[PDB]
Amino acid sequence: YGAIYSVSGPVVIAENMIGCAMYELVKVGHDNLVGEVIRIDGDKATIQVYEETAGLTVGDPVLRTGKPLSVELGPGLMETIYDGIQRPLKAIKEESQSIYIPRGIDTPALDRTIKWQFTPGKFQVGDHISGGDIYGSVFENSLISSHKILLPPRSRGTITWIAPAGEYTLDEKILEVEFDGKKSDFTLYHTWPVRVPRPVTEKLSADYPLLTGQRVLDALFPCVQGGTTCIPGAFGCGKTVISQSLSKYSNSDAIIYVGCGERGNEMAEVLMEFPELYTEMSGTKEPIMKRTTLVANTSNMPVAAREASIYTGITLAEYFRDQGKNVSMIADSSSRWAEALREISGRLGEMPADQGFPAYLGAKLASFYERAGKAVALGSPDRTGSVSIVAAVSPAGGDFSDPVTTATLGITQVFWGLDKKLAQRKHFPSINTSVSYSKYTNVLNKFYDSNYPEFPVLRDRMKEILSNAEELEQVVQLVGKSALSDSDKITLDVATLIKEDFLQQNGYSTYDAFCPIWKTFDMMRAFISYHDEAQKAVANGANWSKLADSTGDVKHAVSSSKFFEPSRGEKEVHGEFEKLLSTMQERFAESTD
Template identity: 50%
Template sequence: MSTHKGTIYRVSGPLVIAENVRGVSVYEVIEVGEERLIGEAIGVEGDKAIIQVYEDTTGLKVGDPVYPTGQPLSAELGPGLIKSIFDGIQRPLPVIEALSGIFVRKGVRVTPLPRDKKWYFIPLVKPGDKVIEGDFIGYVNETEVVKHYIMVPPGINGIIEWVASEGDYSIVEPIAKIGGKEVSMLQKWPVRRPRPYKEKLEPREPFITGIRVIDFLFPLAKGGKAAVPGGFGTGKTVLLHTVTKWSEADITIYIGCGERGNEMADALNSFIKLIDPKTGKPMMERSIFIANTSNMPVAAREASIFLGVTLGEYYRDMGYNVLLVADSTSRWAEAMREISGRLEELPGEEGFPAYLASRLAQFYERSGYVKTIGSTERTGSLTIMGAVSPPGADFSEPVTQSTLRLIRALYALDVNLAYRRHYPSINWLTSFSLYVDNVTEWWSKISHEYSYLRER
């Protein structure tokens, strides 16, 4: 870990090269300039570090200081996530609006989760109990529909020496002591590191979206991964909004990655007004939004993707079925292309970096239906749907082709169907699902004619 203050050597858009920083690790958070802008080291060469800055770098100059933190980019996990609206690096946008107005001011620092809010904690263990990582210590009612379980953090095992009595506590107050270590309701987890699980299972149950052409013809399984490619105006965003609103997910996470701000505003507005038919409560009571729109720094698109999947894994570990929607992974790929170009790396096809497919894989492969860690038998799922925006509806372009190798369900949107106002414009000849055999047994319990009718 480095605490040595360095200086800026060169600035190139969202990239900053700093010198005299020794001992810095790749993906370590580095604060840049007098305003301490949040950045992440994406390359280290001797005592120089290449920093990807997640805020506007206008005004930075050679000689300005940089401050290594010794910590990776991490997500705060705990009560207060549901109903939140974050930017790509988990800053709560409603709190920032109260501080700096409708535009995010450079260098503004706000904790992702409120430290002053009290949560009514109900313990589920007692002193003397033996617990392992992933076990439930207790719970709080995060919203009227989501019970937030407080879990033993990964890496901690032992005997419960002390546990807080039922009552109101903030997320930073100790609620238990396990093997000499105090545990609070707040956990931090590096966004680029997948959270652990016991075993990844083959998906067997369909993830019901409420859209007939998907559920019947091209089913998606719980813990599955799917892509929605389509040209401009074919209805990608509307389809993803619809799935997010009406699917059977316990928790929904919507990432607006580089798309227009009005689309995000529309989703937020409808989620506040819409009533969930299962619970009778507003949809917002089980939703998290990450708003990283097109007018925000491009570098933060990558952070928003990995932040969203980390939050999804956290609720999966509680035993919930989580849906993560990313709109759109193409905007993230375009950000990668810009960063790669500024680094003067050897370009791949159409100027995208050679590591495009591996970065997409790091995201999609964190989906899954798993046995969670913990001493009790518990399963949870994280289902991922990512929109792809191929220019000119050309599905042969690199982002679509790289995504096709990773996903197991494709909902290809057709320009001609969309122009004929046939929505959702899912082309039934181009689309496919590799989950059909997985879910046939489940469907046969509903109707023994499922396979016959689908094949017809």
Template identity: 50%
Template sequence: MSERVGKIYRIAGPLVVATDIPNPMMYEVVYVGKEGLIGEVIAVRGEKIYIQVYEETTGLTVGEKVEATGRPLSAELGPGLIGSIYDGLQRPEKDIARLLNDIFIRRGVKLPSLDRSRKWYFVKERSVNVGDKVYPGDIIGYVNETPLVKHYIMIPPNVKGELKWIADDGDYAVEDTIAVVSSGQQEFNVKLYHIWPIRIPRPYVEKLNPVEPLVTGIRVIDHVFPIAKGGKAAVPGGFGTGKTVLLQELTKWSHADIAIYVGCGERGNEMSDALTSFLKLMDVRRGRPMMERSVFIANTSNMPVAARETSVFLGITIAEYFRDMGYDVIIVADSTSRWAEAMREISGRMEEMPGEEGFPAYLASRLSEFYERAGKVKALGKPERFGSVTIFGAVSPPGGDFSEPVVRNTVRYVQSFYALDYGLATRRHFPAINWLTSYSMYVDFVKEYWDKVTDGKWSKYRLTMLRILQREAELSDIVRLVGPEALPEEDKLVLEIARIIREGFLQQSALDPVDAYSPPEKGIVMMEAIMEFYKKALEAVSKGVSVSKIREFKSRYMLYQLKFYSIDDLKKLIPQFLETLNQEFGSLVKH
């Protein structure tokens, strides 16, 4: 086959227009200029081929060659992903730093995504034998990638046939053939890794309803606006409302098997902070370093804007790969707004008809391509297994305006919405999730699970707390006009309990070693203590006791301190709290 080479016709920042490439294909990878900058065909208009270049284009000149590869932009999937730090093109940043002895990635640099020299100990699946028929997704062995992740080696999704040969247990590099599959006259060499196009969702047998909650360790999410494994959520908020910290906390503490953090146009210092903290952190459930179950895709704001799109799709492709092994995966993208801004810039340079606020008309469809790849599925192949991908996407609306196009189009494709409120952030209430504008459509899906493990308490307590917070919001206008003392005692009690819920339960410190992660059983104990206090206080107020007296109780102050105790210490403290509560309300009602 002859070389498919064209030449540069025009350069417009990250957009390069080429001509003379025979039979150009949409989304195929091309190498641009003398340095072979990586680009992708995003439009073909007559003889002109529009290329989105994922590296800095300064210095390119008209007439330089453009070489088409005939393949789509793809990810290498195999052992070595866990603990890695990639850029948006899956270039290994740690290896590049060692090679170049530089803190920046020079353009044109190409290194394999997976280390070709490292050996992995492959263990053959005992139920698989030569002569067996194998199908896409069948597990033929595994590699212990880290103490937390058993990396299953699967038949690639596009391969099936008769197993002609399989390697014995031993050390192999990712390029080594570990099995041979025959299909008719063709033979396919199965290696420890395979390649998959990042824009094409990986296949599965069936998508299932998400019925099991993804525990995040954040009380306002777990107990008020829960998300299910396989769910999709948006986290919009203006500058300073705590998006990055919240997303980092979700990645650190969520009960997922694999965590993928995608910095999509993030500032370098924020990515550096996330990496530094992850290198020090231990997985609280398994007592192992957090990096042993994490993958980082570090696309920073000083990198070419076009690569923001590849970082998002690379992240979701890696997530689907581990999902197919039967793992529950969480992927965090911070932030999709910067991806949308990159789309706007490329669209403008292509002279396309702009949509609302200059964003391209296809903004909604691109966002849907990303979010619709979340879900809980039955994976291909044997043995039977189920996995999930849960997506949290940050949105950074200018000025915190939730009516802008990226937020509105994101809301169409997510079922959980965690609205970060600037007013809460200025009052140092974190996480600044506004309980009046946030919502979760997974409540009915996970209700049965939560009620089963809490004897029905979770639903009851959650509804009561939300009613109290809603009533507080209704009373706030009256309080501003006439002051709280003009309210009847029942309404004063609502304000008091709402404050306890806000400050003693919903507010959570990411910097406190105990409060940063709140296990689900701790949240239930705290909810029960607050509801018990509310029940006693309601009874006392109905008998003529003033709320001002109740405010002086020691048991009230104890409620604010519960979050700073570990679950083991809390279990010891609760009997003391209940004893104090009963004594104080008992003596008050007598008098």
């Protein structure tokens, strides 16, 4: 078909290439290098080849795929590792037995050899089918019991043939639909353009919390499955616990992890830690890899792959959302993706808008984060999925002022402010309460009043007592320790107890690896009640020092409240917390005498 005309770095011009679309990917050269069209001049199309082009010869045929950058959606993309453009790095290594990635390799994104057990759905021959309609399910792995396969959203017609129950490979056709006479064959997989958001019937308001287990962010700065989150990706801030808690203990039915441009060492650490990370349901019996697919890109990869990493990840997340599975997408570093965009723009010579970034960076981020959210999936049956994004930001200079982090903070509703100092002092998960915030607190009021009505007032009471103690720390350093009133010292001690036994969570320990929402709420009640009882008793009673020294046993009890095993059962834990509160009330009543 086409032919190479001129090459200069990553950009290639192909002559007599009439009939190619805008962003249509093509197979460049005899090596069949993949490249994306970016400009058209009659028959001459400007191609942004991904890999190195030092070997291309003017005259090499270039074949147009006919489709834009599309990810292969279907069974077999779970538990797999991909690059930005969804190349099966595991299969890449196995088929070539080479240390490095072969240039121009074209291993299918989904394993074409695996035979998948397929049970057809309620749709039958002669029925009318539209995009997103489940016409069968495939048992992918032991954790994703039913991988609902979907008709592609842009396709519709009248079903004329369905493969019966059995085992099929992804190359086998299993569905024929008729639309305007022409037949269409549908296999177990379908490709979707990566940049167009995958459509839904209706996008709802995300109101169910994204329970991660980390008590500090599950209580103080909650997130909703379908919300957007921003965390600092700086070195040593302890974002590993956040990523592992979302991929290990969250409500998500699937996990999408994307490495945009992370360094090679860190990506290696991620790729070794994730396979040896096990789930929580049914008592830690399965690997989270069965629930997680990864997009991995080291420091030096095709820049287009780094730029398209997050788009591929969010497209996979949307594909699983359309099945009714609540997914959560974790971005290794949005700053690396912004750097990839900046280098792409520099290669294209576009006008630098802000600090060298393109003018559409804010729009791109806004659209990408709006791709997330709870939504009714397209087609029948009526199932609802959700995509939540936890994107990490890591400015080069750490000033937290470059436009990418400002746009992310403006768009994302919840920000979990991991801090260097807290991690230095061995305080984990090292979330800086003073700077962190969550705008989903108002939305979650419905869920709280339905489940834990007392939760919001307890949450903002803890917020204000920690803020008061934070400011009284400066007051103390200004004047002296003795200048505090009794109530001020009550606030100080309550805040210190909170920082030691509620915000701080060991994570590796069995008792606090996963703190459920009911246990979190019970600890909310315990700590807030302790503060309120101390405040009232001192206000209408004797000096604080005697009471606190005498009531140190109750303080130790509410400290050990962190040690209550959630595995004992929610009812048992709630009853034991009620016993603890009863003994607390009785013992404070005895002390105030």
